[PDB]
């Protein structure tokens, strides 16, 4: 059971004088020969993808910062200095910019893999909490970063996603001014964002430290509602070399596609308007902040008192909870409820591979995510308003009511024993 196999430091004198600093003991006993089940599909790779992508972003950023100058008058020029003069330039920038896209794409699949195979269910709450914390940090990071080029979309995205904090009453304008460094956006905001943007990744790495510490102490989830049967465990092959090699193969494929993009379709995920300098006096059409924030942008700009299911007219009972504040609360709740999940699913069961109704609702949820992604880009004119309202309502409904009802009446399936599934 949970064979650590510390190696007893019996190799030789080198492995015996290393009794001063244990380090190799840690690596070997724990982070390399960690028994993992055999039943792992191709959905348990994306964590390696995320770690590599994080390293990539940190490196490329440390390189760019050697040529980026945070200032309204010299940011654009420095970016062009990069893409033209520097030796590698375009590569670093395109790899930095697009890799953010892959990062978020990979976390999406990392998260939805989790919702299916009960990875939030006990005893794996801490991992979930830490993951939501990370998600928040990395969203804030990417936001701070999209601003640095001082293009045109930078300015206005910052403007609105800071007016949010100002929507709330009493302490809105104060926070807004304390965050922007002033009444509106200017170089001060740029300096804050650069610093902050150059600091959070390390916090993320530490949090990834705790993320990795947790699911090593707590066994990796597995396609089944079963554990490694610790009591000797013919199942649960080790990590190295088997799963290391599997993950590296998938990672090679992913990097292949990523570099093909970088080299042929690099400006595809971007907004052309970010290639024109900023004008605080003129706003372009369809700001469309980005593609990894459209869901929440839509959940925000949906509630506007423009439907018979408009709960804003009812929330107006209290004269303080206006629309804006309502949408902001709705977004914060869209995330808080995803974090609260493990204490809402009242099921003494596990992976939805044995819960059909859950399968249907979950695929509807994935569809809802895609729809929200597609709607945040389209205007607030009919019919898109009804669509956004329906989708947000279903998100909240799933995460609040649907899981309890299932946990109550959702066991028409024969659960599998013997995690050694030699089929």
């Amino acid at each position: 059971s949970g064979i650590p196999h510390d190696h007893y430091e019996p190799k030789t004198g080198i492995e015996k004088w290393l009794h001063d600093r244990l380090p190799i003991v840690g690596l070997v006993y724990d982070t390399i020969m960690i028994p993992t089940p055999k039943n792992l599909n191709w959905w348990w790779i994306w964590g390696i993808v995320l770690a590599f992508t994080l390293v990539l972003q940190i490196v490329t950023g440390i390189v760019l910062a050697m040529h980026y100058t945070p200032h309204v008058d010299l940011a654009f020029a420095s970016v062009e200095h990069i893409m033209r003069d520097v030796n590698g330039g375009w590569a670093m920038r395109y790899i930095h910019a697009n890799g953010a896209s892959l990062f978020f794409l990979a976390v999406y699949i990392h998260i939805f893999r989790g919702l299916y195979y009960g990875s939030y269910k006990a005893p794996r709450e801490i991992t979930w909490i830490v993951g939501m914390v990370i998600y928040l940090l990395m969203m804030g990071t990417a936001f701070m970063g999209y601003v640095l080029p001082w293009g045109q979309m930078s300015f206005w995205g910052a403007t609105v996603i800071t007016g949010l904090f100002g929507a709330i009453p009493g302490i809105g304008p104060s926070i807004q001014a304390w965050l922007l460094g002033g009444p509106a956006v200017d170089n001060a905001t740029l300096n804050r964002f650069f610093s902050l943007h150059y600091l959070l990744p390390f916090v993320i790495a530490a949090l990834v430290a705790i993320h990795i510490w947790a699911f090593h102490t707590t066994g990796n989830n597995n396609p089944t509602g079963v554990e490694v049967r610790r009591t000797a465990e013919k199942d649960t092959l080790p990590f190295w070399p088997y799963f290391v090699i599997k993950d590296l193969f998938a990672l090679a494929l992913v990097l292949l596609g990523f570099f093909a993009v970088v080299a042929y379709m690099p400006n595809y995920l971007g907004h052309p308007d970010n290639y024109v300098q900023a004008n605080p006096l003129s706003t372009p059409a369809h700001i469309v902040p980005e593609w990894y924030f459209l869901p929440f942008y839509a959940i925000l700009r949906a509630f506007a008192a423009d439907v018979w299911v408009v709960i804003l007219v009812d929330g107006l009972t209290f004269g303080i909870v206006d629309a804006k504040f309502f949408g902001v609360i709705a977004m914060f709740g869209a995330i808080a409820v995803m974090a609260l999940a493990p204490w809402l699913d009242t099921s003494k069961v596990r992976s939805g591979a044995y819960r059909p109704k859950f399968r249907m609702w979950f695929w509807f949820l994935v569809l809802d995510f895609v729809v929200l992604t597609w709607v945040g880009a389209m205007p607030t004119e009919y019919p898109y308003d009804w669509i956004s309202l329906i989708a947000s309502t279903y998100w909240f409904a799933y995460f609040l009511v649907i899981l309890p009802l299932l946990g109550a009446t959702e066991k028409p399936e024969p659960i599998p024993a013997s995690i050694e599934e030699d089929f």
Partner: protein, 181 residues
């Protein structure tokens, strides 16, 4: 005493910690160079009354647009009913009703109001810049960030934006100038 001494040491440590932390949260506030936040003299100077005039100030645009009769009549024909914000956000006067007579502007040092209207070109939803030049579904301004329709006099309509376009404190400089601040 055990309790008193221990708890007092802890309290003093906490107080010192807070006194050290506060400035780390104070430096991010507006600095003195941002404290200035003063006025601007924009000269109307025959810009062909009726289209628009925009000028930068305080980091935000200040819209100075003449009036087109059709725009005017549409304005003056708006009863307070069915008007989201009837407060006439203009700070050059009290909270008087959001009426075009009060909402257009001072009268050149003369006596007339249905000819000029200078407001803050900042959407009250989240601070975007609406597009002018007769746009939207009300012959006024349209915000492209979320779709808020403004009217001729700038009062909010058809969107999430809660209130109309504010009007800063401004007076005239004897028939060719504007004082913003």
């Amino acid at each position: 005493r055990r309790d008193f001494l221990y708890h007092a040491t802890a309290a003093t440590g906490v107080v010192v910690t807070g006194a050290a932390v506060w400035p780390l949260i104070n430096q991010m506030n507006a600095s003195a160079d941002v404290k200035a936040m003063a006025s601007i003299f924009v000269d109307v100077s025959a810009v062909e009354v009726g289209t628009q005039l925009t000028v930068k100030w305080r980091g935000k645009p200040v819209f100075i647009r003449r009036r087109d009769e059709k725009d005017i009549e549409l304005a003056r024909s708006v009863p307070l009913g069915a008007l989201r914000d009837t407060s006439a956000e203009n700070a050059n006067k009290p909270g008087a009703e959001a009426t075009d007579e009060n909402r257009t502007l001072p009268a050149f040092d003369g006596t007339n109001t249905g000819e000029w209207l200078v407001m803050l070109g900042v959407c009250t939803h989240l601070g975007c810049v609406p597009m002018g030049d007769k746009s939207g579904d009300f012959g006024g301004w349209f915000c492209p960030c979320h779709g808020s329709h403004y009217d001729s006099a700038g009062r909010i309509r058809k969107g999430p934006a809660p209130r109309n376009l504010d009007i800063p404190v401004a007076a005239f400089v004897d028939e060719t100038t504007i004082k913003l601040g």
